[PDB]
């Protein structure tokens, strides 16, 4: 399980790997990461599946009443307090690990670690068992100000190397760009997964 | 017996010698007493809601007061009755709604949206220590399946769709002119639905609303959302009452 | 493990019209017989029968619930009880206890009271229904009684076969097992009578 | 213990194993793991052996109630939903692991529901103890958009390979079909293994029986 | 006749007498009046002294629901300190469920659906509060919410409840305050209390202000002595 | 709660006699007549049915007469609706019974049992009493054949032959004289119960669908429970007319 | 006539009667004073005779150290209150370990008595009181009522025939501020007797006070204690 | 919590009030006759509207309890969306022990008995409604009438509502054995045109059947051709 997700100026990009393995072998070897706790945001799923997918449901729920009653999209600041709550009264039984990335009418792109029942605001956010493999790649080749054709190219190099490294991790990457006008969610297939040193 | 009364009948909600229940009788006097009128109409890919606005002083700010609400995305509602009422439901639709998706994961329909909000009013029926709520709800939508759905909730718990509504002070003789319109089958588009819908007030009422004296809400296949049409996006629609 | 503490053992087998069901007579703690007079077959009423296996507390236990639950539900309804549901009772009866089980694996034999309609089946600790065509066995024999069932059990068979059938394979099914013996009680539920017998069995 | 799922154009078809064993022993070698939900929604129990019928029963009474309630057909999201949260509930001591299928008017659609609530939709899957070797036949003939009349034979070529390289799953194959019409149901569609005979009758003269109590109830 | 005994029963003509009654318990409260300007909103109450020996400052009727949220409250002062206590309740789970400052028209909308569901058993009274929430944001603007017995929920440009109410409600009016600055709206609220008061029953009372808006970077506050002292005497030489 | 809506269904009288149960005895007055007479051999119970129409049924069972144990027996004079919580609550009583102590419900263990039910709505909870008044049959290993008539109120005892129900008045001075104590037998008290309902029925005739008969005998140390059918019963009557002449 | 009967039923004045009836409870009873100045806050209490062979009511309770209160009311109705102040105080040093602020005190009180006027079935408590504290805002003088309504005060007078003790506190209100301990406590003293009549006047044995101040916690002077306070007023 | 005490009471007369007038809102409502004969059971109610805007799709009397059973009414109409609900449940709760469809003896018995606890609870009236249950079990139809008081009978054939005395007589005249399901649809139809005025369309009359094919509502197209007065 690798999550990412990475911060520029009109959005954010939340890229993800697919494949889902108990044990060292693979549940779905097609899965999606990225389940919308509303329009313009997006939650990475990490950890239990049985977990995440439990919390990231009660997060999507209890975030709809909040838009419903505001009568107006809930910021990202909200869907990550919500996804706090409920990681961290639960943190003995659930083992489960969101990330929440998104945009806003305020603040614009956001990105928030949930890890464990804290709270962060990121430029950019790594998760799942793969990520630490890439944390050389994301400390040198990040640079402040990247355009949205960069950042997804950056959040692409990035995981790619971490389904090589990863044994639990693996699959085609997704890729949500949150903007202003909508969600671009693109899907990049094994053959447009950039090459890195083979041997 | 014909209005018979025998001990306790009146005051709390139990059968009458003549089995009637008086005291939802009268939960149909708290809707006239909100001193207003709405009317919603069905057309063929549209359901139009239009709701008589009233700001009486300068001081009320126009954007703070609505009958129009938003239930979920795709719903749409317009609550005629008590104020107080109105908004206790609303706020429980809303619950029920999101619960709805949050159990059966998909949203709600219109016509089950209007059941769970009846068999509730039917507890505060039966129960003796409550009264029931004042507030009669009317909800439209548009249902993948069936199309454009507009339905009505009283506070007996009796909910029924209707092709053409009416609520509040006037209704019997606002409804008078729906058979006159509705029996001659019109073809309905969206325009041809909001002129005629805002003519069934203007009949009435003998008025011919200005922009700031309306709201409508509006659905269609086209917008499954549910929309609020501007001040000038109504006064668009009121040039064509100068012509037919 | 635990239900094999006191022992014993049950069979149920289906014939044609007819059914028979069986069980030892031996009530023991571990190594250490007591009495030879236990009970492990109850009546249900006319032309049914349960049996019960396992740990002997909940044998006792478990049957005084039955007969609670069933004249509840005979008196209720105007018809006797059919085999098929009270399959489904006794279920929901263990079922209930998943998370303390009662421990026993009920075998229930018997007639549908509509004509002559034979059922069988056989239950576990969580109570998951079993219905076969053939024969249900339980207890902590059960590994010979299976091997014993299968050879000798036929599709169809008169009343007379079936006690032949299920008596010798009740008595050799027995004589491998340490802790059942001490006799065998078998009954043959027909669609006319019922026909109970005890079978001479070696004392050890 | 194996069963499996598969989407084609149409619609889905759910397949299973009939032989269920408790340690080791055939308890009974005919038994039905599909069971019924709604009339176009059907599912696999696999798992603890009542843990994935008493399930089934709860999910399929919940949606006869909203079926009736609502006057609409049931929605294949709807049941994933009941069993998800009725198997998170007990925080994974229930072990049933259900693969939930059927047509609604959204299109095909196939769930899968992990024993702790862990569900995935996809085009194909396979649960219990043999899910190894029918999801490996399943990656490798696989391909979207399937005729019916050749779905068939990739199923039960899937079980198949399940039921002969696995010792916990035997007997005969069950499959389900499901479109647009729906409830299309197909018992003991495939049998592995035909020679069942068993000749040398035992079968003896009655008469030897050292019986001492016998007694008559006339009735 | 028995129809008004409890708030569980409608009178034959519909309405809810023990709801209305609750009403009439905030038309012999003293006055309060709420209004918003470019900048921010701006309270105003009279605070009546019944006696000499009460300390300056006591029986407070501006709470302060959160750091970014007012209160006014007119009627019977005992349920007041109940429903800040409450409102406070909501603006704290607010702050722990979503972390963030509550906005206005959710926070009069949970304490208008509290005080609502007292109107409806019979074990239960109505509230005889009414009570106005102004507040303000850089990404919302001058907000104000007034709650009445009933738990209905408007907004405003300026507003009067309690005794005075048609009387204060048209002189607002004549004012126009959409393009004013708060700095300049301080002096015109003590301008509009000390016209509407007037002295025939009641004898003296303690003019309260408070700010909010652009001037306190959203923070509520009191307005401070200078500034009260500067707004306080230019309604007095306004008087004539 | 609102006491303005109470009625106060436990407190006493000004005479000390609770009026919701007064009011029970007044509906049990004008509802089925029901009799029994306890013989050397056998109890029987005789209900009249107050719904007779052509358009019923007559699905069930004696319509009236239940069953609360394989021993025993019970009829009912008083509302139809409240008689069914009694007898499923008679029915977990035995079983409770015979759940510890693994054997047959004696007949004074079950009436007092359930006499504890109706006094705890009689006595607090402030719901409305039961309108139902029972008569009860039995048989038990220590005092033989039992006739139990309980009532609103909890009240019972031990009775040779009793009635209730309406004209239960005049009923009763008949079985006073007619019945003779040890020299009953069941087909002497079958002709008694008759010539006791003939002059109390409000219809004349005696037709076989009203009065039906349910018998308890004991035979092979088994309690036999039978509900006489309409031929046995227009038979019994026939041979009762033929005496009033001939 | 049918309004009276119920804590939740409102009138067509918009009146609870019973609440009204409850601020009766505290006109039936003694009255009781009490004042502060920058320093000192000083409770003084008429502890009424049921007759001359019986002993008097305690009107002063302790409540914590810097904390203490004059009931005037039902007697074994103000020891709920009492109850719940002492546990209110004592759980303010076992958590903060701090003295618990008396505006703090009294808006919990505000909570208690709210809920039975709020509640049906439920009687309001008819106890007055008054709450004499020390804190690092100064000393407090609080009045409470049956309505949970309550006040912030330089000086009060509640119980039966009252409004004469607050009178006399009005004149006086401008030296109260620099009074000693002894002038001040003087102050209530004088206040006691305008509510009784000239038929009685004060003694060691009907008289209780209490004082709390800067450096001095809450301490109750009870018989002996009150005579050199006594002696030197001249009546 | 609410009101622990009992709104039912003994009168001096011995006769429950409450119940009295429950079975007085019942004979104002919508006309509804039934009929078992041979092998199913007819239930034809007349839902009578006030105009043309009116949804007939939206709402429906006779309702399905399961598929073995269903269920029309005559009196309060909201009253009767809490029995069906109630009823579904209990149909559900049987099939979930005894694992066969509840027969209808078995679910009268239950259903009655919850109309029995609202005579006794506290704070509750008893429902207004008088239902009409029909079921088809063991090749047996059944046709059960439950009402307020929780007294459940078995009628071969009955009518409610507006002129229920009036029904019931046309239905001895009528009424017999060897009658088709077929007649029975005819003569339920014929007593609602002595009950009902003006003219009976698709729209007006609601009909459901009950037989071996389990039960199910009459669409009206189904239902205009029985109004052709053939069948």
Not at chain 4, 54 to 62: E, F, L, V, Y
Not at chain 7, 156 to 172: C, F, K, N
Request: hydrophobic share 40%; proline share 3%.
């Amino acid at each position: 399980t690798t999550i990412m997700a990475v911060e520029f100026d009109g959005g954010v990009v939340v890229g993800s790997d697919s494949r889902v393995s108990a044990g060292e072998a693979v549940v779905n070897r097609v899965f999606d990461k990225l389940s919308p706790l509303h329009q313009h945001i997006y939650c990475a799923l990490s950890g239990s599946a049985a977990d995440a997918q439990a919390i990231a449901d009660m997060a999507a729920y209890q975030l709809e009443l909040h838009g419903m009653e505001l009568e107006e999209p809930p910021l990202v600041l909200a869907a990550a307090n919500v996804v706090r709550n409920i990681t961290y009264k639960y943190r003995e039984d659930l083992s489960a690990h969101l990330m929440v990335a998104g945009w806003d009418q305020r603040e614009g792109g956001q990105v928030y670690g949930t890890m464990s029942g804290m709270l962060i605001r990121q430029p950019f956010a790594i998760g799942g068992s793969g990520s630490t493999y890439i944390y050389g790649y994301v400390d040198a080749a990040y640079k402040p100000g990247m355009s949205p054709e960069e950042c997804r190219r950056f959040t692409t190099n990035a995981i790619a190397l971490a389904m090589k490294r990863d044994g639990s991790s693996g699959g085609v990457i997704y890729l949500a760009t949150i903007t202003g006008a909508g969600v671009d969610h693109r899907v990049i297939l094994g053959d447009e997964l950039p090459r890195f040193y083979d041997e | 017996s014909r209005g018979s009364s025998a001990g306790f009948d009146r005051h709390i909600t139990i059968f009458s010698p003549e089995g009637r229940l008086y005291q939802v009788e009268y939960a149909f006097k708290a809707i006239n007493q909100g001193g207003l009128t709405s009317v919603a109409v069905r057309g063929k890919d549209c359901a139009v809601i239009v709701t008589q606005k009233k700001v009486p002083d300068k001081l009320l700010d126009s954007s703070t007061v609505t009958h129009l609400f938003k239930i979920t995305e795709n719903i749409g509602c317009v609550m005629t009755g008590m104020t107080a009422d109105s908004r206790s439901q609303v706020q429980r639709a809303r619950y029920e709604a999101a619960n709805w998706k949050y159990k059966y994961g998909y949203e709600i329909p219109v016509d089950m949206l209007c059941k769970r909000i009846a068999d509730i009013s039917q507890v505060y029926t039966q129960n003796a220590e409550m009264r029931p709520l004042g507030c009669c709800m009317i909800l439209i939508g548009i249902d993948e399946e069936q199309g454009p759905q507009v339905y009505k909730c009283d506070p007996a718990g009796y909910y029924c769709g209707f092709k053409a509504t009416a609520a509040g002070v006037k209704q019997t003789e606002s409804t008078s002119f729906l058979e006159k319109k509705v029996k001659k089958k019109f073809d309905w588009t969206f325009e041809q639905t909001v002129e005629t819908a805002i003519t069934c007030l203007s009949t009435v009422l003998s008025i011919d609303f200005k922009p700031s004296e309306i709201e409508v809400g509006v659905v269609t296949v086209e917008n499954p959302k549910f929309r609020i049409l501007t001040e000038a996006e109504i006064d668009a629609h009121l040039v064509a009452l100068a012509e037919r | 493990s635990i239900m094999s503490y006191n022992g014993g053992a049950v069979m149920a087998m289906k014939g044609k019209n007819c059914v028979a069901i069986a069980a030892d007579r031996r009530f023991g703690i571990q190594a250490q017989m007591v009495t030879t007079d236990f009970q492990k077959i109850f009546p249900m009423g006319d032309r049914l029968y349960i049996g019960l296996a396992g740990l002997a507390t909940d044998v006792q236990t478990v049957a005084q619930r039955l007969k609670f639950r069933l004249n509840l539900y005979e008196l209720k309804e105007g018809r006797q009880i059919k085999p098929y549901t009270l399959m489904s009772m006794v279920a929901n009866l263990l079922y209930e206890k998943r998370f303390g089980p009662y421990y026993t694996e009920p075998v229930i034999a018997g007639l549908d009271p509509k004509t002559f309609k034979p059922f069988i089946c056989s239950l576990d600790l969580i109570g998951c229904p079993m219905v076969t065509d053939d024969f249900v066995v339980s207890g902590t024999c059960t590994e010979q009684m299976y091997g014993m069932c299968e050879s000798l059990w036929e599709p169809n068979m008169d009343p007379e076969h079936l006690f032949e059938t299920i008596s010798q394979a009740m008595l050799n099914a027995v004589d491998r097992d340490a802790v059942s013996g001490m006799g065998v009680i078998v009954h043959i539920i027909e669609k006319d009578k019922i026909t109970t017998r005890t079978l001479k069995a070696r004392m050890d | 213990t194996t069963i499996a799922g598969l989407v084609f154009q149409d619609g889905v078809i759910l397949g299973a194993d009939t032989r269920a064993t408790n340690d080791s022993v055939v308890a009974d070698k005919i038994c039905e793991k599909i069971h019924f939900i709604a009339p176009k929604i059907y599912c696999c129990g696999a798992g603890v052996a009542a843990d994935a019928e008493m399930t089934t029963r709860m999910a399929a009474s919940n949606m006869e109630l909203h079926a009736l309630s609502t006057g609409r057909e049931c929605r294949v999201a709807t049941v994933t939903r009941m069993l998800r949260q009725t198997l998170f509930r007990y925080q994974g001591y229930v072990g049933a692991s259900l693969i939930v299928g059927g047509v609604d008017f959204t299109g095909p659609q196939l769930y899968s529901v992990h024993p702790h609530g862990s569900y995935s939709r996809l085009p194909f899957t396979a649960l219990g103890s043999g899910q190894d070797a029918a999801i490996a036949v399943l990656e490798d003939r696989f391909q979207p958009n399937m005729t019916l009349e050749a779905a068939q034979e990739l199923l039960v070529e899937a079980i198949t390979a399940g039921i002969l390289g696995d010792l916990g799953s035997g007997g005969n194959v069950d499959a389900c079909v499901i479109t647009a019409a729906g409830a299309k149901m197909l018992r003991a569609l495939s049998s592995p293994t035909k020679p069942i005979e068993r000749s040398s009758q035992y079968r003896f003269a009655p008469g030897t029986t050292p019986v001492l109590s016998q007694t008559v109830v006339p009735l | 006749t028995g129809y008004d005994l409890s708030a569980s029963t409608f009178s034959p003509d519909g309405r809810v007498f023990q709801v209305e009654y609750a009403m009439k318990a905030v038309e012999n409260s003293s006055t309060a009046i709420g209004i918003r300007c470019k900048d921010g909103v701006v309270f105003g109450v009279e605070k009546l002294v019944l006696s000499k020996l009460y300390e300056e400052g006591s029986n407070k009727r501006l709470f302060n629901v959160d750091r970014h949220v007012g209160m006014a409250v007119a009627g019977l002062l005992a349920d007041a300190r109940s429903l800040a206590d409450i409102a406070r309740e909501e603006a704290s789970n607010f702050r722990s469920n979503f972390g963030y400052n509550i906005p206005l028209k959710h926070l009069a909308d949970r304490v208008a659906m509290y005080v609502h569901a007292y109107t409806l058993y019979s074990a239960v009274r109505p509230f005889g509060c009414s009570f106005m929430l102004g507040s303000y944001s850089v990404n919302d603007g001058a907000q104000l919410y007034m709650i009445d017995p009933s738990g209905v929920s408007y907004g405003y440009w300026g507003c009067a409840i309690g005794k005075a109410r048609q009387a204060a409600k048209t002189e607002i009016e004549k004012l126009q305050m959409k393009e004013m600055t708060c700095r300049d709206v301080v002096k015109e609220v003590a301008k509009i209390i000390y016209i509407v008061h007037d002295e025939v029953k009641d004898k003296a009372f303690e003019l309260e202000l408070s700010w909010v808006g652009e001037i306190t970077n959203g923070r509520h506050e009191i307005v401070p002595k200078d500034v009260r002292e500067e707004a306080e005497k230019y309604a007095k030489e306004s008087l004539k | 709660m609102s006491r303005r809506y109470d009625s106060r269904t436990t407190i006493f009288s000004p005479e000390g006699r609770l009026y919701q149960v007064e009011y029970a005895m007044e509906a049990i007055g004008h509802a089925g007549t029901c009799l029994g007479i306890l013989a050397n051999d056998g109890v029987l119970l005789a209900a009249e049915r107050r719904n007779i129409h052509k358009l019923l049924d007559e699905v069930f069972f004696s319509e009236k007469i239940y069953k609360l144990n394989e021993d025993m027996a019970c009829s009912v004079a008083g509302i139809t609706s409240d008689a069914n919580v009694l007898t499923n609550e008679l029915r977990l009583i035995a079983q409770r019974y015979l759940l510890q102590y693994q054997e047959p419900i004696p007949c004074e263990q079950l009436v007092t049992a359930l006499c504890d039910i109706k006094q705890a709505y009689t006595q607090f909870g402030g719901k409305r009493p039961f309108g139902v008044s029972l008569l009860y049959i039995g048989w038990d290993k220590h005092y033989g054949f039992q006739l139990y008539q309980s009532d609103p109120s909890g009240n019972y005892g031990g009775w040779k032959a009793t009635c209730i129900g309406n004209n239960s008045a005049a009923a009763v001075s008949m079985l006073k004289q007619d019945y003779k104590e040890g020299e009953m037998t069941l087909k002497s008290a079958l002709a008694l119960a008759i010539k006791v309902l003939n002059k109390t029925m409000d219809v004349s005739k005696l037709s076989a669908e009203k009065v039906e008969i349910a018998t308890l005998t004991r035979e092979n140390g088994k309690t036999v429970i039978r509900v006489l059918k309409q031929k046995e019963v227009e038979q019994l009557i026939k041979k009762h007319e033929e005496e009033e002449a001939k | 006539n049918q309004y009276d009967n119920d804590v939740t039923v409102w009138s067509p004045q918009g009146r609870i009667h019973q609440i009204e009836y409850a601020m009766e409870a505290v006109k039936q009873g003694s009255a009781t004073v009490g004042l502060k100045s920058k320093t000192h806050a000083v409770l003084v209490a008429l502890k009424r005779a049921q007759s001359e062979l019986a002993a008097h009511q305690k009107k002063i309770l302790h409540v914590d150290n810097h904390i203490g209160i004059s009931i005037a009311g039902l007697t074994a109705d103000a020891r709920l209150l009492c109850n719940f102040m002492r546990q209110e105080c004592l759980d303010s040093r076992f958590v903060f370990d701090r003295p618990l602020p008396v505006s703090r005190l009294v808006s919990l009180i505000g909570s208690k008595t709210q809920i039975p006027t709020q509640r049906y079935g439920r009687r309001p408590y008819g106890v007055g009181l008054l709450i004499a504290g020390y804190d690092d805002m100064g000393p407090h003088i609080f009045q409470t009522c049956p309505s949970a309504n309550y006040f912030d005060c330089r000086a009060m007078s509640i119980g039966a025939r009252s409004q004469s003790a607050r009178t006399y506190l009005e004149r006086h209100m401008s030296e109260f501020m620099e009074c000693n301990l002894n002038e001040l406590v003087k102050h209530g003293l004088r206040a006691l007797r305008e509510t009784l009549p000239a038929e009685q006047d004060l003694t060691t044995k009907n008289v209780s006070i209490g004082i709390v101040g800067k450096d001095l916690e809450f301490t109750i002077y009870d018989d002996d204690d009150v005579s050199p306070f006594l002696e030197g007023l001249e009546e | 919590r609410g009101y622990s005490f009992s709104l039912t009471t003994f009168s001096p007369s011995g006769k429950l009030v409450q119940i009295e007038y429950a079975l007085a809102a019942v004979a104002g409502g919508a006309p509804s006759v039934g009929i078992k004969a041979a092998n199913g059971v007819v239930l034809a109610t007349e839902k009578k509207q006030k105009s043309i805007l009116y949804d007939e799709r939206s709402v429906h009397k006779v309702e399905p309890i399961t598929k073995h059973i269903g269920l029309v009414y005559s009196g309060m109409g909201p009253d009767y969306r809490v029995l069906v609900h109630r009823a579904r449940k209990l149909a559900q709760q049987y099939y979930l022990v005894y694992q066969e469809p509840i027969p209808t003896a078995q679910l009268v018995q239950r259903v009655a008995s919850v109309m029995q606890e609202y005579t006794q609870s506290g704070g509750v009236r008893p429902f207004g409604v008088s239902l009409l249950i029909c079921g088809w079990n063991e090749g047996r139809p059944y046709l059960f009438q439950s009402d307020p008081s929780g007294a459940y009978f078995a009628w071969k054939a009955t009518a409610m509502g507006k002129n229920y005395v009036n029904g019931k007589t046309f239905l001895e005249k009528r009424y017999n054995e060897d009658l088709e399901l077929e007649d029975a649809i005819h003569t339920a139809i014929l007593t609602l045109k002595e009950s009902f005025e003006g003219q009976m369309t698709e729209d007006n009359i609601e009909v459901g059947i009950c037989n071996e094919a389990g039960f199910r509502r009459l669409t009206p197209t189904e239902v205009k051709d029985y109004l052709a007065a053939i069948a």
